[PDB]
Scaffold this motif. Structure first.
Motif, PDB file in Angstrom:
ATOM      1  N   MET B   1       6.672   4.324   6.875  1.00  0.00           N
ATOM      2  CA  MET B   1       5.963   5.716   7.169  1.00  0.00           C
ATOM      3  C   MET B   1       5.149   5.840   5.682  1.00  0.00           C
ATOM      4  O   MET B   1       4.034   6.572   5.870  1.00  0.00           O
ATOM      5  N   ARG B   2       5.494   5.554   4.693  1.00  0.00           N
ATOM      6  CA  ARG B   2       4.843   5.627   3.268  1.00  0.00           C
ATOM      7  C   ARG B   2       4.061   4.186   2.790  1.00  0.00           C
ATOM      8  O   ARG B   2       4.491   4.065   1.694  1.00  0.00           O
ATOM      9  N   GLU B   3       3.667   3.420   3.690  1.00  0.00           N
ATOM     10  CA  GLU B   3       3.363   2.291   3.249  1.00  0.00           C
ATOM     11  C   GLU B   3       2.230   2.202   2.343  1.00  0.00           C
ATOM     12  O   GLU B   3       1.295   2.793   2.527  1.00  0.00           O
ATOM     13  N   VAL B   4       2.398   1.270   1.460  1.00  0.00           N
ATOM     14  CA  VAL B   4       1.330   0.944   0.348  1.00  0.00           C
ATOM     15  C   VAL B   4       1.011  -0.367   0.520  1.00  0.00           C
ATOM     16  O   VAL B   4       1.799  -1.333   0.213  1.00  0.00           O
ATOM     17  N   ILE B   5      -0.519  -0.827   0.721  1.00  0.00           N
ATOM     18  CA  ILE B   5      -0.888  -2.184   0.729  1.00  0.00           C
ATOM     19  C   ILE B   5      -1.294  -2.672  -0.529  1.00  0.00           C
ATOM     20  O   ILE B   5      -1.833  -2.045  -1.326  1.00  0.00           O
ATOM     21  N   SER B   6      -0.618  -3.750  -1.127  1.00  0.00           N
ATOM     22  CA  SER B   6      -0.866  -4.272  -2.458  1.00  0.00           C
ATOM     23  C   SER B   6      -1.683  -5.492  -2.226  1.00  0.00           C
ATOM     24  O   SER B   6      -1.565  -6.269  -1.465  1.00  0.00           O
ATOM     25  N   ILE B   7      -2.701  -5.465  -3.182  1.00  0.00           N
ATOM     26  CA  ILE B   7      -3.785  -6.604  -3.085  1.00  0.00           C
ATOM     27  C   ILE B   7      -3.619  -7.263  -4.739  1.00  0.00           C
ATOM     28  O   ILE B   7      -3.405  -6.296  -5.525  1.00  0.00           O
ATOM     29  N   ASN B  42      10.224   0.048   3.552  1.00  0.00           N
ATOM     30  CA  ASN B  42       8.961   0.163   4.368  1.00  0.00           C
ATOM     31  C   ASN B  42       7.788   0.512   3.673  1.00  0.00           C
ATOM     32  O   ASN B  42       6.504   0.151   4.099  1.00  0.00           O
ATOM     33  N   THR B  43       8.118   0.868   2.357  1.00  0.00           N
ATOM     34  CA  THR B  43       6.811   1.140   1.275  1.00  0.00           C
ATOM     35  C   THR B  43       6.013  -0.004   1.032  1.00  0.00           C
ATOM     36  O   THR B  43       4.931  -0.240   1.093  1.00  0.00           O
ATOM     37  N   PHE B  44       7.030  -1.257   0.889  1.00  0.00           N
ATOM     38  CA  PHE B  44       6.427  -2.576   0.507  1.00  0.00           C
ATOM     39  C   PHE B  44       6.666  -3.597   1.203  1.00  0.00           C
ATOM     40  O   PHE B  44       5.981  -4.553   1.196  1.00  0.00           O
ATOM     41  N   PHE B  45       7.455  -3.504   2.351  1.00  0.00           N
ATOM     42  CA  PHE B  45       7.966  -4.422   3.141  1.00  0.00           C
ATOM     43  C   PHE B  45       7.928  -4.083   4.798  1.00  0.00           C
ATOM     44  O   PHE B  45       7.964  -2.864   4.909  1.00  0.00           O
ATOM     45  N   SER B  46       7.422  -4.886   5.651  1.00  0.00           N
ATOM     46  CA  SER B  46       7.361  -4.763   7.005  1.00  0.00           C
ATOM     47  C   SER B  46       8.527  -5.775   7.518  1.00  0.00           C
ATOM     48  O   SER B  46       8.342  -6.751   7.389  1.00  0.00           O
ATOM     49  N   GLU B  47       9.392  -5.125   8.108  1.00  0.00           N
ATOM     50  CA  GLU B  47      10.615  -5.921   8.957  1.00  0.00           C
ATOM     51  C   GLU B  47      10.206  -6.264  10.320  1.00  0.00           C
ATOM     52  O   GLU B  47       9.595  -5.610  10.948  1.00  0.00           O
ATOM     53  N   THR B  48      10.674  -7.623  10.606  1.00  0.00           N
ATOM     54  CA  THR B  48      10.447  -8.171  11.817  1.00  0.00           C
ATOM     55  C   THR B  48      11.755  -8.096  12.428  1.00  0.00           C
ATOM     56  O   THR B  48      12.914  -7.916  12.245  1.00  0.00           O
ATOM     57  N   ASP B 112     -10.324  -9.081   6.683  1.00  0.00           N
ATOM     58  CA  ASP B 112      -9.537  -9.459   7.676  1.00  0.00           C
ATOM     59  C   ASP B 112      -7.997  -9.425   7.932  1.00  0.00           C
ATOM     60  O   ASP B 112      -7.428  -8.729   8.581  1.00  0.00           O
ATOM     61  N   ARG B 113      -7.394  -9.987   6.700  1.00  0.00           N
ATOM     62  CA  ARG B 113      -5.986  -9.877   6.580  1.00  0.00           C
ATOM     63  C   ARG B 113      -5.561  -8.293   6.505  1.00  0.00           C
ATOM     64  O   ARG B 113      -4.634  -7.908   6.725  1.00  0.00           O
ATOM     65  N   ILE B 114      -6.241  -7.794   5.573  1.00  0.00           N
ATOM     66  CA  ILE B 114      -6.181  -6.342   5.055  1.00  0.00           C
ATOM     67  C   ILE B 114      -6.019  -5.498   6.331  1.00  0.00           C
ATOM     68  O   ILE B 114      -5.215  -4.391   6.630  1.00  0.00           O
ATOM     69  N   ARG B 115      -7.040  -5.777   7.108  1.00  0.00           N
ATOM     70  CA  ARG B 115      -6.871  -4.998   8.664  1.00  0.00           C
ATOM     71  C   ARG B 115      -5.601  -5.288   9.224  1.00  0.00           C
ATOM     72  O   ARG B 115      -5.138  -4.257   9.844  1.00  0.00           O
ATOM     73  N   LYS B 116      -5.369  -6.581   9.272  1.00  0.00           N
ATOM     74  CA  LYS B 116      -4.182  -6.856  10.140  1.00  0.00           C
ATOM     75  C   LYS B 116      -2.863  -6.094   9.558  1.00  0.00           C
ATOM     76  O   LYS B 116      -2.076  -5.549  10.020  1.00  0.00           O
ATOM     77  N   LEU B 117      -2.858  -6.181   8.206  1.00  0.00           N
ATOM     78  CA  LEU B 117      -1.781  -5.408   7.582  1.00  0.00           C
ATOM     79  C   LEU B 117      -1.915  -3.800   7.608  1.00  0.00           C
ATOM     80  O   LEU B 117      -0.722  -3.334   8.087  1.00  0.00           O
ATOM     81  N   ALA B 118      -3.071  -3.272   7.771  1.00  0.00           N
ATOM     82  CA  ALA B 118      -3.235  -1.670   7.867  1.00  0.00           C
ATOM     83  C   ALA B 118      -2.972  -1.363   9.231  1.00  0.00           C
ATOM     84  O   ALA B 118      -2.452  -0.170   9.555  1.00  0.00           O
ATOM     85  N   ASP B 119      -3.250  -2.356  10.133  1.00  0.00           N
ATOM     86  CA  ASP B 119      -2.958  -1.902  11.439  1.00  0.00           C
ATOM     87  C   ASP B 119      -1.307  -1.997  11.740  1.00  0.00           C
ATOM     88  O   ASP B 119      -0.826  -1.256  12.744  1.00  0.00           O
ATOM     89  N   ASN B 120      -0.554  -2.556  10.996  1.00  0.00           N
ATOM     90  CA  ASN B 120       0.696  -2.239  10.942  1.00  0.00           C
ATOM     91  C   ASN B 120       1.602  -1.352  10.103  1.00  0.00           C
ATOM     92  O   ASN B 120       2.824  -1.038  10.312  1.00  0.00           O
ATOM     93  N   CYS B 121       0.483  -0.353   9.881  1.00  0.00           N
ATOM     94  CA  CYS B 121       1.230   0.873   8.824  1.00  0.00           C
ATOM     95  C   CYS B 121       1.015   1.930   9.642  1.00  0.00           C
ATOM     96  O   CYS B 121      -0.091   2.302   9.991  1.00  0.00           O
ATOM     97  N   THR B 122       2.038   2.749   9.738  1.00  0.00           N
ATOM     98  CA  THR B 122       2.125   3.908  10.639  1.00  0.00           C
ATOM     99  C   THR B 122       1.366   5.004   9.585  1.00  0.00           C
ATOM    100  O   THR B 122       0.431   5.511  10.028  1.00  0.00           O
TER     101      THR B 122
END
Ligand SMILES: Nc1nc2c(ncn2[C@@H]2O[C@H](COP(=O)(O)OP(=O)(O)OP(=O)(O)O)[C@@H](O)[C@H]2O)c(=O)[nH]1
Ligand SMILES: Nc1nc2c(ncn2[C@@H]2O[C@H](COP(=O)(O)OP(=O)(O)OP(=O)(O)O)[C@@H](O)[C@H]2O)c(=O)[nH]1
Ligand SMILES: Nc1nc2c(ncn2[C@@H]2O[C@H](COP(=O)(O)OP(=O)(O)O)[C@@H](O)[C@H]2O)c(=O)[nH]1
Lengths: 431, 430, 22, 430, 21
Positions: B1-7, B42-48, B112-122
């Protein structure tokens, strides 16, 4: 995955290349039959920088041996690691150049250069990504200097963006081997200034001095000089082959070393060179390694740095080391010897760290210094070339090979202009 | 819910990312294999569906060796294989190489990969860009990626935890050059830029942790602790919660002025631990000490504009209020006249987790003080002359020109840095 | 620092002069 | 009741049919001997009194080698031996040879056996013709068979899964010639023609499956998975059932415009699997990515007209609706002004079965996005100059002329393809 | 010395621009 294409030119070049490939095979755990025998993952992780895989476990060096007489490469093949090289990469003429750069560049080199470029292109096209070509050869020799300069020009034409590295054995100051060394060196330096992106200067008398004073050997053959040169050749590129805390490729070293395109000549040195007697007595520490690096006697060029000023200097350390220690040592050296360092460059040191030291050594460090001291080496070459060219002694040998007299004057002018730029940046004051 | 994308861009970025992700895995209990034996990850990890947790991170580099080190090391089963992006040729400390010629395709794949990651963040609090101002990969490719992110994502908060060259000690020669270029690039893209200096962190390790041979692993561990303290309010509940968006609103007085000094406290080794109280007031004073700051920049020269304190552990709001009152009453610390408050306190109930094998000791209280202060103009003044000393002779200029730059780009960057100096003076003075 | 600022100003003036000449 | 007759013409047709029928046997539990240890097989197989199930397929080729490989391989007791039809002399990449001289008796016997198949089907959804545009056997004989099927059967839906020549990479020399001829032939006979490119599927294998040495087996397996996803609604029940007759009605706006691009998702190896959640939204985005498109034709150049989605596995209509809403709100995806809906979603409760020995992973969700878009005119534009560049010199024209062709046929085919270009431009324009 | 000389250069360039206007 950043490949390097090695080339050996002339008798001295072939000997240096053979010793270098022996050293590299020892580092990577490669036996003379080509099979890996290292028992280390890191050795095979980046083996493709130098070797290609055969049908089996055999590894073939990406090396091209070039000469106009077959005796030198016959000796190379008879050497302990002569069987690793692919027999197709031995390109030889039949009549060797009689220490004639004109013969090795125009008359006899024209026929062999097509085969040489064919082999070079075949080796380069197989490379996934090419960092560049490294050519080991000796200035002051016919086939070596001539064929090397011609091939360097051809490779520069074919691959402009690719890195070009040169290990040139410049003729020694005091004792000269052949008489036509000043002609060959003057003609070759003109080509190297224009073509070679990175060029490193070696002198046999500097090697003798370092091996007699630091190593304290009694009967130093050419094998030992080739050993030191090979150590420098390996240490300059160990960052490509091994993981590093702060890695630096050949292009990074060139960018951090060369301020202006023509000032690409460097003097190199290897540490720690320790005498057998004092091996146990010496302490392997970062300050000790840096102190040995910055000694004038440790330099493998005849020119001594104290006379000139260090434009730039790259230091590639190897071993599990403290980056704070290395950086503090570099800064302390610069502060202490600020007179010998250029004022208009705030930091004259490019420090790189690799995590894998050479076998047997806990620590090591290779030094590559761009300093205006090499001005005196070029000046001595000029003092010999001009004196002999005034009377045109041995000029007819070059003239009969289809070489214009004006080429000598042009080469001398280029080398004197290089000397002038070195002096200008040595005495250049900020602002 | 509070996801942060790390580069993590460049050698420095990837190496600090190693420590950062080790720290996060230890903090959330995630084993290096990927899964742990709520929903704070959920801030740093997305679970499968399999239960394995994968970080929302992207390791970008034009050099393959550094990324292959991660691909081979312990965290090989944690990260996404395609998320690890590797180039073929290094930027060779050339901002032009990393920004104009080599960086194009790599940054396209990165988007491209950042977009894939951001699409997975609420939700998406923002991006955490960790690069090295002073290297072609870090400077050029990081600047290009930040520009593309500003173009497409827009108002997402990008926090650049940049490592700037130290005043006297350094490892490169063209470092002032590409540092000036990257500074001009990121003056207008990143929302909050955190300055870090290797010399300052080396001094911290030497005097506090008593390490006479500090290394990059120790530096990255300290930086990872700082970032964990910064993000702790997103993952763990506590009184006076602070948000990524709240950082800029409480900390950035003007859009141009968003460079910030960072100081963590206490920095104590295992040996000397539990020998002092380490109370709230003492740790606040330690954080405000000029020596504890992670940039070679004396705060006494300038004036603090804003100070955000992130408290971790057994910290109570009255303790933080008393400590900040003492700090305000302290005469060495000088604030600007137009910011009477100048303070943003945020507490969290999660004490800082200690990495086994590290030098930090287990402390029940911690402070991360991140301050916008006009003193930071000093480091820009230093780089502004370290650059101009070579630029007078146009040394190494041909190297940058060869990969699609012009003298005009250097001129514009240097003029922009001078304008930044002038702006810092203007805000600092009444 | 002031020197190099004024140098960039001089370079901009030179570029303007060249454009005017064109 | 929902029988579909499969025709495989040429080497490419037979080799993709091998993968297709292996996939169908694995999906329906049919052992390669012919029988399994309801009535979902009726679409592809007809069961006999003894219990052996024989596919309703016809392997047509003028070369004996490809058919003999099937006759000798594992699937020798499955297929009907007379249904395997073998010629004597190959068409030698000559459209005239495959359409006028050699193909006559072969197509006569082909229609005979196809009539025998159609007489065994209560219902008949249509024909699935799998050929290779760019070779004499596939182009000439396939075109002749399509013409005969249009003449005799009439309104039966003929879906042609054609493999067009790639833009730059190719294996034949007269491929532009016979491709133009076959395209002129099939513009007016097939009902929905699906374009496939070997270069695009190679790119899919290299990037998504991480296969550095893709081969025809891999390409055929991907094509087989796409066709299985296409036919899944005929054999397995689920919400939003989609039919063969519904494909044309929701996908073909005008009879000339029935060439369509295909894209499957996800394409992930076992190692890369369970690193991402593979949600409905993510797989839909991957399906709409140009890189996953199975034709070397960037859809960004054109505008989408219709998009049919076949979802397989655990997919809920709410998720598919949210994903399609996100796609519609996306700016990069552009639809024609005259098709406000442009979407045909259909879900199925059967996950895609995994072929042992393949590279595809066992994914619980799958998407087959088959789209009619005006961008497809680009490939025709490529072949239209590849043809005329050779045709100016009349190179290789005598080879076609010798087997009963005329220069008028080449002129008519070229003009027809130019008219198709004009039609695509006109439909794209407002 | 260099500052005053190069400032004079700046002034000359500005005067040239004004003349060309
Ligand atoms: N604090 C810190 N700084 C580091 C670390 N590693 C590298 N750096 C800094 O990063 C700078 C160079 O980083 P990079 O640009 O990524 O080096 P690279 O990966 O080889 O890429 P290029 O040098 O640009 O070709 C150096 O000047 C170092 O000062 C680290 O582990 N910690
Ligand atoms: N994607 C894919 N294409 C294939 C495969 N096999 C063949 N092709 C294509 O099919 C084309 C030729 O097919 P055919 O006409 O049937 O070849 P043939 O059976 O010898 O018959 P002729 O060439 O006409 O004489 C080639 O251009 C290939 O590109 C395959 O397995 N996968
Ligand atoms: N270090 C080293 N130098 C050598 C060796 N052999 C020859 N040299 C030196 O190289 C110089 C040039 O000789 P070279 O160019 O190889 O002769 P060429 O091959 O006939 O052109 C001579 O002055 C030698 O002193 C060797 O094995 N090692």
């Amino acid at each position: 995955m950043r490949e390097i294409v090695h080339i050996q030119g002339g008798q001295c070049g072939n000997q240096i290349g053979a010793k270098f490939w022996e050293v590299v095979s020892d580092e990577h755990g490669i036996d003379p039959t080509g099979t890996y025998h290292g028992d280390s993952d890191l050795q095979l992780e980046r083996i493709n920088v130098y070797f290609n895989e055969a049908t089996g476990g055999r590894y073939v060096p990406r090396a091209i041996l070039m000469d106009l007489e077959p005796g030198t490469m016959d000796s190379v093949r008879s050497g302990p690691y002569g069987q690793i090289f692919r027999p197709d990469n031995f390109v030889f003429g039949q009549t060797g150049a009689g220490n004639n750069w004109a013969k090795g560049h125009y008359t006899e080199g024209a026929e062999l250069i097509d085969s040489v470029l064919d082999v070079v292109r075949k080796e380069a096209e197989s490379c996934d990504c090419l960092q560049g070509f490294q050519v080991c050869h000796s200035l002051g020799g016919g086939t070596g200097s001539g064929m090397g300069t011609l091939l360097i020009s051809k490779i520069r034409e074919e691959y402009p963006d690719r890195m070009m590295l040169t290990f040139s054995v410049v003729p020694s100051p005091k004792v000269s081997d052949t008489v036509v060394e000043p002609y060959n060196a003057t003609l070759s330096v003109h080509q190297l200034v224009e073509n070679a992106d990175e060029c490193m200067v070696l002198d046999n008398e500097a090697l003798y001095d370092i091996c007699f004073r630091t190593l304290k050997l009694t009967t130093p053959t050419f094998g030992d000089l080739n050993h030191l040169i090979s150590a420098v050749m390996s240490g300059i590129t160990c960052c490509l082959r091994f993981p590093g805390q702060l890695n630096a490729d050949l292009r990074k070293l060139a960018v951090n070393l060369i301020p202006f395109p023509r000032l690409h000549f460097f003097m190199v040195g290897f540490t720690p060179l320790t005498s057998r007697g004092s091996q146990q007595y010496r302490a392997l520490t970062v300050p000790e390694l840096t102190q040995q690096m910055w000694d004038a006697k440790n330099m493998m060029c005849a020119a001594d740095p104290r006379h000139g000023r260090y434009l730039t200097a790259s230091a590639l350390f190897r071993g599990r080391m403290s980056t704070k220690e290395v950086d503090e040592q570099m800064l302390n050296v610069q502060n202490k010897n600020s007179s010998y360092f250029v004022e208009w460059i705030p930091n004259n040191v490019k420090s790189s760290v690799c995590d894998i030291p050479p076998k047997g050594l806990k620590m090591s460090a290779t030094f590559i210094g761009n300093s205006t001291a090499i001005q005196e080496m070029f000046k001595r070459v000029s003092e010999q070339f001009t004196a002999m060219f005034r009377r045109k002694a041995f000029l007819h040998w070059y003239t009969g090979e289809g070489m214009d007299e004006m080429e000598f004057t042009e080469a001398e002018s280029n080398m004197n202009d290089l000397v002038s730029e070195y002096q200008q940046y040595q005495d250049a004051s900020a602002e | 819910m509070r996801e942060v994308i790390s580069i993590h861009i460049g050698q420095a970025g990837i190496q600090v990312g190693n420590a950062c992700w080790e720290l996060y895995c230890l903090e959330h209990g995630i084993q290096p294999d990927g899964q742990m034996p709520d929903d704070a990850f959920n801030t740093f990890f997305s679970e499968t569906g399999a239960g394995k947790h994968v970080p929302r991170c992207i390791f970008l580099d034009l050099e393959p060796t550094v990324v292959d080190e991660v691909r081979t090391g312990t965290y090989r089963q944690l990260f996404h294989p395609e998320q690890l992006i590797s180039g073929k040729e290094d930027a060779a400390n050339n901002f032009a190489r990393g920004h104009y010629t080599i960086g194009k395709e790599i940054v396209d794949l990165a988007l491209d990969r950042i977009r894939k990651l951001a699409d997975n963040c609420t939700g998406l609090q923002g991006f955490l860009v960790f690069n090295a101002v002073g290297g072609g990969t870090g400077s050029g490719l990081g600047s290009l990626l930040l520009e593309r992110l500003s173009v497409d994502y827009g108002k997402k908060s990008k926090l650049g935890f940049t490592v700037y060259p130290s005043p006297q000690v350094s490892t490169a020669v063209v470092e002032p050059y590409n540092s000036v270029l990257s500074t001009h690039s990121l003056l207008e893209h990143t929302d909050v830029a955190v300055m870090l200096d290797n010399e300052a962190i080396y001094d911290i390790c030497r005097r506090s942790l008593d390490i006479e041979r500090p290394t990059y692993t120790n530096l990255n561990r300290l930086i990872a602790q700082v970032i964990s303290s910064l993000t702790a309010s997103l993952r763990f509940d506590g009184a006076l919660n602070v948000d990524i968006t709240e950082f800029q609103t409480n900390l950035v007085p003007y859009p141009r002025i968003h460079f910030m000094l960072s100081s963590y406290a206490p920095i104590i080794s295992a040996e000397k631990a539990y020998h002092e109280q380490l109370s709230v007031a003492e740790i606040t004073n330690a954080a405000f000490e000029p020596a504890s700051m992670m940039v070679k920049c004396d705060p006494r020269h300038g004036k603090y504009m804003a100070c955000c304190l992130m408290y971790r552990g057994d910290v109570v709001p009255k303790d933080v209020n008393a400590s900040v009152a003492t700090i305000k009453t302290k005469r060495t610390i000088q604030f600007v006249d137009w910011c009477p408050t100048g303070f943003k306190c945020g507490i969290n109930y999660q004490p800082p987790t200690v990495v086994p094998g590290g030098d930090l000791a287990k402390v029940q209280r911690a402070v991360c003080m991140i301050s916008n202060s006009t003193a930071i103009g000093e480091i820009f003044s230093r780089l502004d002359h370290k650059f101009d000393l070579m630029y007078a002779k146009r040394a190494f200029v041909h190297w940058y020109v060869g990969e699609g730059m012009e003298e005009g780009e250097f001129s514009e960057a240097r003029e922009d840095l001078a304008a930044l100096e002038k702006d810092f003076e203007e805000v600092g003075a009444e | 620092k002031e020197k190099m600022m004024m140098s960039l100003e001089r370079d901009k003036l030179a570029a303007r002069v060249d454009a005017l000449e064109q």
